[PDB]
Coordinates of C-alpha atoms in Angstrom, one line a residue:
Chain J
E1422 CA -6.6 9.5 34.8
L1423 CA -5.7 6.4 32.7
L1424 CA -7.9 4.0 34.7
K1425 CA -10.8 6.5 34.4
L1426 CA -10.6 6.0 30.6
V1427 CA -11.3 2.3 31.0
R1428 CA -15.0 1.7 30.6
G1429 CA -15.3 -16.6 26.0
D1430 CA -12.6 -19.3 26.5
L1431 CA -13.5 -20.8 23.1
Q1432 CA -11.1 -21.2 20.2
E1433 CA -12.7 -24.3 18.8
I1434 CA -13.7 -21.9 15.9
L1435 CA -10.4 -22.6 14.2
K1436 CA -10.7 -26.2 15.1
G1437 CA -13.8 -26.6 13.0
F1438 CA -12.1 -25.0 10.0
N1439 CA -9.7 -26.5 7.5
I1440 CA -6.6 -24.4 8.0
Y1441 CA -3.9 -24.1 5.4
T1442 CA -0.6 -25.4 6.8
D1443 CA 1.9 -25.7 3.9
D1444 CA -3.8 -23.0 21.2
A1445 CA -0.4 -23.7 19.6
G1446 CA 1.2 -20.8 17.9
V1447 CA 4.3 -22.7 16.8
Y1448 CA 5.9 -22.7 13.4
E1449 CA 8.8 -24.8 12.1
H1450 CA 11.1 -23.4 9.4
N1451 CA 14.4 -24.7 8.2
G1452 CA 14.8 -26.7 11.4
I1453 CA 14.1 -23.7 13.6
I1454 CA 11.0 -23.8 15.8
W1455 CA 9.3 -20.4 16.2
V1456 CA 6.5 -19.3 18.5
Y1457 CA 4.3 -16.2 18.2
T1458 CA 1.9 -14.5 20.4
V1459 CA 0.0 -11.1 20.7
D1460 CA -1.7 -9.4 23.6
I1461 CA -3.0 -5.9 24.1
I1462 CA -4.3 -4.7 27.4
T1463 CA -6.1 -1.7 28.8
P1464 CA -4.4 0.4 31.6
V1465 CA -3.9 -1.5 34.8
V1466 CA -2.4 1.4 36.8
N1467 CA -2.5 5.2 36.4
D1468 CA 1.3 5.3 35.8
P1469 CA 1.9 5.3 32.0
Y1470 CA 5.5 4.0 32.4
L1471 CA 4.4 1.0 34.6
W1472 CA 1.5 0.2 32.3
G1473 CA 3.9 0.0 29.3
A1474 CA 6.4 -2.2 31.2
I1475 CA 3.6 -4.5 32.7
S1476 CA 1.9 -4.9 29.3
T1477 CA 5.3 -5.9 27.8
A1478 CA 6.0 -8.5 30.5
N1479 CA 2.4 -9.7 30.0
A1480 CA 2.9 -10.1 26.2
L1481 CA 6.2 -11.9 26.6
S1482 CA 4.7 -14.3 29.1
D1483 CA 3.1 -16.5 26.4
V1484 CA 6.5 -17.1 24.7
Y1485 CA 8.1 -18.1 28.1
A1486 CA 5.2 -20.4 28.9
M1487 CA 6.0 -22.3 25.7
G1488 CA 9.6 -22.7 26.7
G1489 CA 10.7 -20.1 24.2
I1490 CA 13.1 -17.2 24.1
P1491 CA 11.5 -13.9 22.9
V1492 CA 13.5 -12.5 20.0
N1493 CA 11.6 -9.5 18.5
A1494 CA 8.3 -7.6 18.7
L1495 CA 6.0 -5.0 17.2
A1496 CA 4.3 -2.4 19.5
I1497 CA 0.5 -2.1 19.2
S1498 CA -0.9 1.1 20.7
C1499 CA -4.6 2.1 20.6
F1500 CA -6.1 5.4 22.0
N1501 CA -8.6 8.2 21.5
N1502 CA -7.3 11.3 19.8
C1503 CA -9.1 13.8 22.0
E1504 CA -8.4 12.4 25.5
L1505 CA -4.8 11.3 25.5
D1506 CA -1.6 13.1 24.5
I1507 CA 1.9 12.2 23.2
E1508 CA 3.6 12.8 26.5
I1509 CA 1.7 9.9 28.2
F1510 CA 2.2 7.7 25.1
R1511 CA 5.9 8.4 25.2
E1512 CA 6.0 7.2 28.8
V1513 CA 4.2 4.0 27.8
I1514 CA 6.9 3.4 25.2
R1515 CA 9.7 4.2 27.7
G1516 CA 8.5 1.4 30.0
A1517 CA 8.0 -1.0 27.1
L1518 CA 11.5 -0.3 25.8
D1519 CA 13.1 -0.8 29.2
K1520 CA 11.3 -4.1 29.8
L1521 CA 12.2 -5.3 26.2
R1522 CA 15.8 -4.4 26.8
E1523 CA 15.8 -6.4 30.0
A1524 CA 14.3 -9.3 28.0
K1525 CA 16.8 -8.9 25.2
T1526 CA 13.9 -8.7 22.8
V1527 CA 14.2 -6.3 19.8
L1528 CA 11.3 -3.9 19.0
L1529 CA 11.2 -3.8 15.2
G1530 CA 8.5 -1.2 14.9
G1531 CA 5.0 -0.2 15.9
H1532 CA 1.5 0.5 14.7
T1533 CA -1.0 3.1 16.0
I1534 CA -4.7 2.3 15.7
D1535 CA -7.6 4.6 16.7
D1536 CA -9.7 3.3 19.6
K1537 CA -12.3 4.7 21.9
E1538 CA -10.4 3.2 24.8
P1539 CA -6.6 3.3 25.6
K1540 CA -4.8 0.0 24.9
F1541 CA -1.2 -1.1 24.5
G1542 CA 0.5 -4.4 23.7
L1543 CA 2.9 -6.3 21.5
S1544 CA 2.9 -9.1 18.9
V1545 CA 6.0 -11.2 19.8
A1546 CA 8.2 -13.7 18.0
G1547 CA 10.4 -16.2 19.8
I1548 CA 12.4 -19.4 19.3
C1549 CA 12.4 -22.7 21.2
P1550 CA 16.0 -23.9 21.7
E1551 CA 16.7 -27.5 20.7
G1552 CA 13.2 -27.4 19.3
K1553 CA 12.0 -28.0 22.8
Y1554 CA 8.6 -26.4 23.2
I1555 CA 6.0 -27.1 25.9
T1556 CA 2.3 -27.4 25.2
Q1557 CA -0.9 -27.7 27.3
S1558 CA -1.8 -31.3 26.3
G1559 CA 1.1 -33.4 27.5
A1560 CA 0.1 -33.8 31.2
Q1561 CA -0.9 -37.1 32.8
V1562 CA -2.7 -38.1 36.0
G1563 CA -0.8 -37.9 39.2
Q1564 CA 1.5 -34.9 38.4
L1565 CA 2.0 -31.8 40.6
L1566 CA 0.6 -28.4 39.6
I1567 CA 3.2 -25.6 40.1
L1568 CA 2.4 -21.9 40.0
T1569 CA 5.1 -19.1 40.0
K1570 CA 3.2 -15.9 40.8
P1571 CA 0.3 -15.1 43.2
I1572 CA -3.2 -14.4 41.8
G1573 CA -5.6 -11.6 42.6
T1574 CA -4.4 -8.7 40.5
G1575 CA -7.7 -8.2 38.8
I1576 CA -9.3 -7.5 42.1
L1577 CA -6.6 -5.0 43.1
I1578 CA -6.8 -3.2 39.7
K1579 CA -10.6 -2.9 40.3
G1580 CA -9.8 -1.5 43.7
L1581 CA -7.5 1.1 42.1
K1582 CA -10.3 2.1 39.6
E1583 CA -12.8 2.6 42.4
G1584 CA -10.3 4.7 44.3
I1585 CA -10.5 2.2 47.1
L1586 CA -6.8 1.4 46.9
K1587 CA -3.7 3.5 46.1
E1588 CA -0.8 2.4 43.9
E1589 CA 1.4 2.6 47.0
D1590 CA -0.8 -0.1 48.5
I1591 CA 0.0 -2.8 45.9
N1592 CA 3.7 -2.4 45.3
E1593 CA 4.0 -6.2 45.8
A1594 CA 1.5 -6.9 43.0
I1595 CA 3.1 -4.3 40.8
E1596 CA 6.5 -5.8 41.2
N1597 CA 5.1 -9.2 40.3
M1598 CA 3.3 -7.9 37.2
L1599 CA 6.6 -6.3 36.1
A1600 CA 8.5 -9.5 36.5
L1601 CA 9.5 -11.5 33.3
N1602 CA 8.6 -15.2 33.3
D1603 CA 12.1 -16.1 32.0
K1604 CA 13.4 -17.5 35.3
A1605 CA 10.1 -19.3 35.7
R1606 CA 10.5 -20.8 32.2
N1607 CA 14.0 -22.0 33.2
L1608 CA 12.6 -23.8 36.3
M1609 CA 9.8 -25.3 34.2
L1610 CA 12.3 -26.6 31.6
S1611 CA 14.8 -27.8 34.3
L1612 CA 12.1 -29.9 35.9
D1613 CA 11.1 -31.4 32.5
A1614 CA 7.6 -30.1 32.9
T1615 CA 5.0 -32.1 31.0
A1616 CA 2.7 -29.1 30.2
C1617 CA 2.6 -25.4 30.8
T1618 CA 0.5 -22.2 30.4
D1619 CA 0.7 -18.8 31.8
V1620 CA -2.1 -17.4 33.9
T1621 CA -3.9 -14.4 32.5
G1622 CA -7.4 -13.2 31.6
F1623 CA -9.3 -16.4 32.2
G1624 CA -8.1 -16.7 35.8
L1625 CA -6.3 -19.5 37.6
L1626 CA -9.2 -22.0 37.2
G1627 CA -9.7 -21.2 33.5
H1628 CA -6.0 -21.7 32.6
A1629 CA -5.8 -24.8 34.7
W1630 CA -8.8 -26.3 32.9
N1631 CA -7.0 -25.6 29.6
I1632 CA -4.3 -28.1 30.7
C1633 CA -7.0 -30.6 31.8
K1634 CA -9.0 -30.2 28.7
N1635 CA -6.0 -30.6 26.3
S1636 CA -4.4 -33.4 28.3
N1637 CA -7.8 -35.2 28.8
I1638 CA -7.5 -35.2 32.6
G1639 CA -8.7 -33.3 35.6
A1640 CA -7.1 -31.4 38.4
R1641 CA -7.5 -30.9 42.2
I1642 CA -6.6 -27.5 43.5
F1643 CA -6.3 -26.6 47.2
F1644 CA -7.5 -23.0 47.9
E1645 CA -5.3 -22.9 51.1
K1646 CA -2.2 -23.6 48.9
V1647 CA -2.9 -21.0 46.3
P1648 CA -0.8 -17.8 46.6
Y1649 CA -2.8 -14.5 46.4
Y1650 CA -2.6 -11.0 47.8
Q1651 CA -4.3 -10.5 51.2
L1652 CA -5.8 -7.3 49.9
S1653 CA -7.5 -9.3 47.1
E1654 CA -9.2 -11.5 49.7
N1655 CA -10.2 -8.4 51.6
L1656 CA -11.8 -6.7 48.6
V1657 CA -13.5 -9.8 47.1
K1658 CA -15.2 -10.4 50.5
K1659 CA -16.7 -6.9 50.2
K1660 CA -18.1 -7.8 46.7
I1661 CA -15.3 -5.7 45.1
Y1662 CA -14.1 -7.4 41.9
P1663 CA -14.0 -7.1 38.1
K1664 CA -17.0 -8.5 36.3
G1665 CA -14.5 -10.7 34.4
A1666 CA -14.0 -12.7 37.6
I1667 CA -17.7 -13.7 37.7
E1668 CA -17.6 -14.4 34.0
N1669 CA -14.5 -16.6 34.4
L1670 CA -16.2 -18.5 37.2
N1671 CA -19.3 -19.0 35.0
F1672 CA -17.1 -20.4 32.3
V1673 CA -15.8 -23.2 34.4
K1674 CA -19.1 -23.9 36.2
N1675 CA -19.7 -27.2 34.3
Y1676 CA -16.3 -28.6 35.2
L1677 CA -16.2 -27.3 38.8
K1678 CA -16.4 -29.7 41.7
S1679 CA -16.3 -27.7 45.0
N1680 CA -18.3 -26.5 48.0
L1681 CA -16.2 -23.5 48.8
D1682 CA -17.7 -20.1 49.5
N1683 CA -18.3 -18.0 46.3
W1684 CA -15.7 -15.4 47.3
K1685 CA -13.0 -18.0 47.2
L1686 CA -14.1 -19.3 43.8
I1687 CA -14.4 -15.7 42.6
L1688 CA -10.9 -15.1 43.8
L1689 CA -9.6 -18.2 42.0
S1690 CA -11.4 -17.0 38.8
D1691 CA -10.1 -13.4 39.0
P1692 CA -8.5 -12.2 35.7
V1693 CA -4.7 -12.1 36.1
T1694 CA -2.4 -9.5 34.6
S1695 CA 1.1 -10.7 33.7
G1696 CA 0.6 -13.8 35.8
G1697 CA 3.2 -16.5 36.5
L1698 CA 3.5 -19.9 34.8
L1699 CA 1.3 -22.8 35.8
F1700 CA 2.9 -26.2 34.9
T1701 CA 2.8 -29.9 35.7
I1702 CA 5.7 -32.0 36.9
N1703 CA 6.3 -35.7 37.7
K1704 CA 6.3 -36.4 41.5
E1705 CA 9.9 -37.5 41.3
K1706 CA 11.0 -33.9 40.6
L1707 CA 10.2 -33.0 44.2
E1708 CA 13.7 -34.3 45.0
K1709 CA 15.3 -31.2 43.5
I1710 CA 12.6 -28.6 42.9
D1711 CA 13.8 -26.6 46.0
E1712 CA 17.4 -26.6 45.0
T1713 CA 16.7 -25.7 41.4
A1714 CA 14.3 -22.9 42.3
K1715 CA 16.7 -21.2 44.8
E1716 CA 19.4 -21.5 42.2
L1717 CA 17.3 -19.9 39.6
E1718 CA 16.1 -17.4 42.1
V1719 CA 12.4 -18.0 41.5
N1720 CA 9.4 -18.6 43.8
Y1721 CA 7.0 -21.5 43.3
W1722 CA 3.9 -22.9 45.0
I1723 CA 2.5 -26.5 44.7
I1724 CA -1.2 -25.8 44.5
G1725 CA -2.5 -29.3 43.7
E1726 CA -2.3 -32.2 41.3
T1727 CA -3.8 -33.7 38.2
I1728 CA -6.4 -36.4 38.7
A1729 CA -8.3 -39.0 36.6
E1730 CA -11.8 -37.5 37.1
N1731 CA -12.5 -35.0 34.3
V1732 CA -13.3 -32.2 36.6
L1733 CA -11.7 -29.2 38.4
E1734 CA -11.9 -30.2 42.0
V1735 CA -11.3 -27.2 44.2
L1736 CA -10.9 -27.9 47.9
Chain F
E533 CA -25.2 -3.9 10.8
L534 CA -21.4 -3.8 11.2
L535 CA -20.8 -0.3 9.7
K536 CA -23.2 1.3 12.3
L537 CA -21.1 0.0 15.1
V538 CA -18.1 2.2 14.2
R539 CA -17.7 5.5 16.0
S540 CA -18.0 8.8 14.1
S541 CA -16.1 11.1 16.5
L542 CA 5.1 6.9 16.4
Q543 CA 8.3 6.0 14.5
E544 CA 9.6 9.5 15.4
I545 CA 8.8 8.8 19.1
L546 CA 10.7 5.5 18.7
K547 CA 13.5 7.4 16.9
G548 CA 14.0 9.5 20.0
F549 CA 14.7 6.5 22.1
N550 CA 17.6 4.1 22.5
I551 CA 16.1 0.8 21.4
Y552 CA 17.8 -2.5 22.3
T553 CA 18.9 -4.3 19.1
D554 CA 21.4 -6.9 18.0
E555 CA 23.5 -7.6 14.9
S556 CA 20.6 -9.6 13.4
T557 CA 18.7 -6.3 13.3
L558 CA 18.8 -4.5 9.9
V559 CA 16.2 -2.0 11.1
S560 CA 15.7 1.7 10.8
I561 CA 12.5 2.4 12.8
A562 CA 9.7 -1.3 8.7
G563 CA 10.4 -4.4 10.8
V564 CA 13.1 -6.5 9.3
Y565 CA 15.0 -9.1 11.2
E566 CA 17.7 -11.7 10.3
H567 CA 18.0 -15.1 11.7
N568 CA 20.2 -18.0 10.5
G569 CA 20.5 -16.4 7.0
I570 CA 16.7 -15.8 6.7
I571 CA 15.4 -12.3 6.4
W572 CA 12.1 -12.0 8.2
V573 CA 9.6 -9.1 8.0
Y574 CA 6.8 -8.5 10.4
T575 CA 3.7 -6.3 10.4
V576 CA 0.4 -5.9 12.2
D577 CA -2.8 -4.2 11.2
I578 CA -6.3 -4.2 12.7
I579 CA -9.3 -2.5 11.1
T580 CA -12.9 -1.6 11.8
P581 CA -15.6 -3.0 9.5
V582 CA -15.3 -1.8 5.9
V583 CA -18.5 -3.5 4.7
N584 CA -21.6 -5.0 6.4
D585 CA -20.6 -8.5 5.1
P586 CA -18.7 -10.2 7.9
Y587 CA -17.0 -12.6 5.4
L588 CA -15.8 -9.8 3.1
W589 CA -14.6 -7.8 6.1
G590 CA -12.4 -10.7 7.2
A591 CA -11.0 -11.3 3.7
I592 CA -10.3 -7.6 3.1
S593 CA -8.8 -7.1 6.5
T594 CA -6.5 -10.1 5.8
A595 CA -5.5 -8.6 2.4
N596 CA -4.9 -5.3 4.1
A597 CA -2.7 -6.8 6.8
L598 CA -0.6 -8.9 4.3
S599 CA 0.0 -5.8 2.1
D600 CA 2.8 -4.5 4.4
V601 CA 4.7 -7.7 3.9
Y602 CA 4.4 -7.5 0.2
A603 CA 5.4 -3.8 0.1
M604 CA 8.7 -4.8 1.8
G605 CA 9.5 -7.4 -0.8
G606 CA 8.5 -10.2 1.4
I607 CA 6.2 -13.3 1.2
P608 CA 3.7 -13.9 3.9
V609 CA 4.4 -17.1 5.8
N610 CA 2.3 -17.3 9.0
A611 CA 0.0 -15.2 11.1
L612 CA -2.1 -14.7 14.3
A613 CA -5.8 -13.6 14.1
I614 CA -6.6 -10.5 16.3
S615 CA -10.3 -9.8 16.9
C616 CA -11.9 -7.1 19.1
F617 CA -15.6 -6.6 19.7
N618 CA -18.4 -6.0 22.1
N619 CA -20.2 -9.1 23.3
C620 CA -23.3 -7.0 24.0
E621 CA -23.5 -5.5 20.5
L622 CA -22.1 -8.3 18.4
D623 CA -22.7 -12.1 18.4
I624 CA -20.0 -14.7 19.0
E625 CA -21.0 -16.2 15.6
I626 CA -20.6 -13.3 13.2
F627 CA -16.9 -13.8 13.7
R628 CA -17.2 -17.3 12.5
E629 CA -17.8 -15.7 9.1
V630 CA -15.0 -13.2 9.7
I631 CA -12.6 -16.1 10.4
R632 CA -14.0 -18.0 7.5
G633 CA -13.2 -15.1 5.2
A634 CA -9.8 -14.5 6.7
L635 CA -8.8 -18.2 6.5
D636 CA -9.8 -18.3 2.8
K637 CA -7.7 -15.3 1.9
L638 CA -4.8 -16.7 3.9
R639 CA -5.1 -20.0 2.0
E640 CA -4.9 -18.0 -1.2
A641 CA -1.8 -16.2 0.1
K642 CA -0.3 -19.6 1.3
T643 CA -0.1 -18.2 4.8
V644 CA -0.5 -20.4 7.8
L645 CA -2.8 -19.1 10.6
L646 CA -1.2 -20.2 13.9
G647 CA -3.8 -19.0 16.3
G648 CA -5.6 -15.9 17.5
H649 CA -6.3 -13.6 20.4
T650 CA -9.7 -12.2 21.3
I651 CA -10.0 -8.9 23.3
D652 CA -13.1 -7.0 24.3
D653 CA -13.6 -3.7 22.6
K654 CA -16.4 -1.0 22.3
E655 CA -16.1 -1.2 18.5
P656 CA -15.7 -4.2 16.2
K657 CA -12.2 -4.8 14.9
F658 CA -10.2 -7.5 13.1
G659 CA -6.7 -7.9 11.8
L660 CA -3.6 -10.0 11.8
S661 CA 0.0 -9.9 13.0
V662 CA 2.0 -11.3 10.1
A663 CA 5.4 -12.8 9.7
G664 CA 7.0 -13.0 6.3
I665 CA 10.3 -13.9 4.6
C666 CA 12.2 -12.1 1.9
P667 CA 13.3 -14.5 -0.9
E668 CA 17.0 -14.2 -1.7
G669 CA 17.2 -11.9 1.3
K670 CA 16.0 -9.1 -0.9
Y671 CA 13.9 -6.5 1.0
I672 CA 12.7 -3.1 0.0
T673 CA 12.3 -0.1 2.3
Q674 CA 11.0 3.5 2.0
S675 CA 14.4 5.2 2.2
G676 CA 16.3 4.2 -1.0
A677 CA 14.6 6.5 -3.5
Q678 CA 16.5 9.2 -5.4
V679 CA 15.6 12.3 -7.4
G680 CA 14.4 11.8 -11.0
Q681 CA 12.5 8.5 -10.4
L682 CA 9.0 7.6 -11.4
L683 CA 6.2 7.1 -8.9
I684 CA 4.2 3.9 -9.6
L685 CA 0.8 3.0 -8.0
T686 CA -0.9 -0.4 -8.4
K687 CA -4.5 0.2 -7.2
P688 CA -6.9 3.1 -7.4
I689 CA -7.6 5.2 -4.3
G690 CA -10.9 6.5 -3.0
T691 CA -12.1 3.6 -0.9
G692 CA -12.6 5.7 2.2
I693 CA -15.2 7.8 0.5
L694 CA -17.1 4.8 -0.8
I695 CA -17.0 3.2 2.7
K696 CA -18.3 6.4 4.1
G697 CA -21.0 6.2 1.4
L698 CA -22.0 2.8 2.7
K699 CA -22.3 3.9 6.3
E700 CA -24.5 6.9 5.4
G701 CA -26.6 4.5 3.3
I702 CA -25.9 6.6 0.2
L703 CA -24.4 3.5 -1.5
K704 CA -24.8 -0.2 -1.6
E705 CA -22.2 -3.0 -1.8
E706 CA -23.5 -3.8 -5.3
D707 CA -22.5 -0.2 -6.3
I708 CA -18.9 -0.7 -5.4
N709 CA -18.0 -4.2 -6.8
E710 CA -14.9 -3.0 -8.5
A711 CA -13.6 -1.3 -5.3
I712 CA -14.4 -4.4 -3.3
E713 CA -12.5 -6.6 -5.7
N714 CA -9.5 -4.3 -5.5
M715 CA -9.6 -4.3 -1.7
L716 CA -9.8 -8.1 -1.9
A717 CA -6.8 -8.5 -4.1
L718 CA -3.4 -9.5 -2.6
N719 CA -0.4 -7.3 -3.5
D720 CA 1.6 -10.4 -4.4
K721 CA 1.6 -9.6 -8.1
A722 CA 2.4 -5.9 -7.4
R723 CA 5.3 -7.2 -5.4
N724 CA 6.7 -9.2 -8.3
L725 CA 6.2 -6.1 -10.6
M726 CA 8.0 -3.8 -8.1
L727 CA 10.9 -6.3 -7.7
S728 CA 11.1 -7.0 -11.4
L729 CA 11.6 -3.3 -12.1
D730 CA 14.3 -3.2 -9.4
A731 CA 12.3 -0.5 -7.5
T732 CA 14.4 1.7 -5.3
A733 CA 11.7 2.2 -2.6
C734 CA 8.2 1.0 -1.8
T735 CA 5.3 1.4 0.6
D736 CA 1.6 0.4 0.4
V737 CA -1.2 2.9 0.5
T738 CA -3.4 2.6 3.5
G739 CA -4.9 4.7 6.4
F740 CA -2.8 7.8 5.8
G741 CA -4.0 8.3 2.2
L742 CA -1.9 8.6 -1.0
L743 CA -0.2 11.9 -0.1
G744 CA 0.6 10.7 3.5
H745 CA 2.2 7.5 2.3
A746 CA 4.0 9.2 -0.6
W747 CA 5.5 11.5 2.0
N748 CA 6.9 8.5 3.9
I749 CA 9.1 7.7 0.9
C750 CA 10.0 11.4 0.5
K751 CA 11.0 12.0 4.1
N752 CA 12.9 8.7 4.5
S753 CA 14.8 9.2 1.2
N754 CA 15.4 12.9 1.8
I755 CA 13.6 14.0 -1.4
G756 CA 10.2 15.5 -2.5
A757 CA 7.6 14.2 -4.9
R758 CA 5.5 15.7 -7.7
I759 CA 2.1 14.1 -8.3
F760 CA -0.3 14.9 -11.1
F761 CA -4.0 14.6 -10.0
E762 CA -4.9 13.9 -13.6
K763 CA -2.8 10.8 -13.5
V764 CA -4.0 9.4 -10.2
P765 CA -6.5 6.5 -10.5
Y766 CA -9.6 6.7 -8.4
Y767 CA -13.2 5.5 -8.4
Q768 CA -15.6 7.8 -10.4
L769 CA -18.1 7.3 -7.6
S770 CA -15.6 8.6 -5.0
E771 CA -15.3 11.9 -7.0
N772 CA -19.1 12.2 -7.0
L773 CA -19.4 11.7 -3.3
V774 CA -16.5 13.9 -2.3
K775 CA -17.9 16.8 -4.3
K776 CA -21.2 16.4 -2.3
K777 CA -19.3 16.9 0.9
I778 CA -19.5 13.2 1.5
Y779 CA -16.2 11.9 3.0
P780 CA -14.6 10.4 6.1
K781 CA -13.2 12.7 8.8
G782 CA -10.0 10.7 8.4
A783 CA -9.5 12.3 4.9
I784 CA -9.5 15.8 6.5
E785 CA -7.2 14.6 9.2
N786 CA -4.8 13.3 6.5
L787 CA -4.9 16.5 4.5
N788 CA -4.0 18.5 7.7
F789 CA -1.1 16.2 8.5
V790 CA 0.6 16.9 5.2
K791 CA -0.2 20.6 5.4
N792 CA 3.4 21.6 6.0
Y793 CA 4.9 19.7 3.1
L794 CA 2.0 20.1 0.6
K795 CA 2.6 22.5 -2.2
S796 CA -0.5 22.8 -4.4
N797 CA -3.4 25.0 -5.4
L798 CA -5.9 22.4 -6.5
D799 CA -9.6 22.5 -5.4
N800 CA -10.2 21.1 -1.9
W801 CA -12.3 18.1 -3.2
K802 CA -9.2 17.0 -5.1
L803 CA -6.9 17.3 -2.1
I804 CA -9.5 15.5 0.1
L805 CA -9.8 12.7 -2.4
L806 CA -6.0 12.4 -2.5
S807 CA -5.9 12.2 1.3
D808 CA -8.8 9.8 1.7
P809 CA -7.9 6.8 3.9
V810 CA -7.3 3.8 1.7
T811 CA -8.3 0.3 2.7
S812 CA -6.0 -2.6 1.3
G813 CA -4.5 -0.2 -1.2
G814 CA -1.9 -0.9 -3.8
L815 CA 1.9 -0.6 -3.7
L816 CA 3.5 2.8 -4.3
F817 CA 7.1 2.5 -5.5
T818 CA 9.9 4.3 -7.3
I819 CA 11.7 3.1 -10.4
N820 CA 14.4 4.6 -12.7
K821 CA 13.3 6.3 -15.9
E822 CA 15.1 3.5 -17.8
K823 CA 12.7 0.8 -16.6
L824 CA 9.8 2.7 -18.2
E825 CA 10.5 0.8 -21.4
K826 CA 9.6 -2.6 -19.9
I827 CA 7.1 -1.8 -17.2
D828 CA 4.1 -2.2 -19.4
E829 CA 5.2 -5.6 -20.8
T830 CA 6.2 -6.8 -17.4
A831 CA 2.9 -5.7 -15.8
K832 CA 0.7 -7.5 -18.4
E833 CA 2.9 -10.6 -18.0
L834 CA 2.3 -10.6 -14.3
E835 CA -1.3 -9.7 -14.7
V836 CA -1.3 -6.5 -12.6
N837 CA -2.4 -2.9 -13.3
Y838 CA -0.2 0.2 -12.8
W839 CA -0.3 3.9 -13.1
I840 CA 2.5 6.4 -13.3
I841 CA 1.4 9.2 -11.1
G842 CA 4.5 11.4 -10.8
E843 CA 8.2 11.6 -10.1
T844 CA 10.6 12.3 -7.3
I845 CA 12.2 15.7 -7.1
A846 CA 14.9 17.5 -5.1
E847 CA 12.7 20.2 -3.5
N848 CA 11.6 18.5 -0.3
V849 CA 7.9 19.1 -0.7
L850 CA 4.8 17.3 -1.9
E851 CA 4.1 19.2 -5.1
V852 CA 0.6 18.2 -6.3
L853 CA -0.3 19.7 -9.7

């Protein structure tokens, strides 16, 4: 039912303006470094509870990618008042509250706004301990690109909408979308990562370019090293994918250097929901990445490395 | 072009749940949070176009979003821009003007924009998530009012009817300059007035209309309120339009929501006007009868208008005479 109610990468706008200051999203006050973010998403599964919990993990992700600790939040819910009821809304909140409790983040309130399409999310406030926050512009050539969750959810969600797939068929993807990036944040910080971002709506290639663009470098990504759901590959090969994937691919066209089949590039551009962290580390950190990860109980994949050529080389 | 893109057809839920909190939480689900001695307040509000002028819409939306911070006794500190729109119906340049208008209003409010988030949407929408701080740790809520207190409002109501008039083409921006200036005005002065008079409770008037928001103070303080239509400030043009059956569906919705607490026999057009969704409204707060002697002097000194519209009562009803 929910999914049946469901129908670029440019922020330079603010760059051109002269902003009052007394991606970023960091604010310093009385020696304390705060980070804020907001994200609202349409249903990604038919289960109201899971949608609420996934949306929460998704919203918190930005804070974790910055090296921060989520502290509080406001719930933002949008829906049509003639298609949805309170019972389903109550379930969304139940999932959100449970995920927030797991994240030790305090919900301070919520606002309901009328919308033709169902949407739920949070505005979140976090703190960066020791003022240590990570950005997307500190990377340098010759560092390794680490990813903490597989990609391909956008394709699976599309499959669910088309009735081609059943929820029971993507339990792995659902578990990954529900997972908080707190442990991934700990790994990233432990390895003294030079830059970080989470992987969401712009796809793996789009978010990787964000790091390249802001750090003035390029990146080489190996398709065969990128973690993704087998079902995602199966569907994308059958031309089954969200329009956002082709849009994301088009957004990176000018920076792309590859000869791979389109289905692979489309897979790599697929919009990710509640994705993992994508970060860069100095080569020397390979000496303990395994020990540190197992200790923090978090998976990781080395998908490539930063290069001097200002391009996104996908091999 | 913006107005024609809009369609034409919670706390209680949260109260029934066990919400994870900590000692730094002085909540009562608005959003108040303490950290290292600082009292922070947060809010978020996103709205559809109120005028066809992209720039004005961005500024008004910003004033509207900051209002909740002011109503809680806080001072806006930083914010994130939230924009929703259809790429096939709107241009990725019209928002340049929306952002320009928002940034200017934020500069005026000494609020730092830290970033933004764009999300596709069938209808155009723009707003902000805002973080504020309460000086001296002084914050105001909607639950501290008591019987025998005066109800004060700082801006006229009736914007929803005028906006409806704009959509229908019955009115022109030039016809509602006063209303636009009121929607554009920050409630920072109103906040100073409210705090100066040691208000016992406060809320701003927005989407739920005067009666709806007045009831929030009533239910949270366990009291009722008596409001005199003849003392409520509103645009003359709003009265004209409402009588001609010209008004937002939201007004009817708001009137129906207060149906169980509403005790009145006034003409429907009066009740509709009073329930009309307000955009960037004024603050509605309660003060002790005593402060009546210095409210006028204080208001003029702060350069802010006010209207005494009624008083709180024991009977737990919304008595509109």
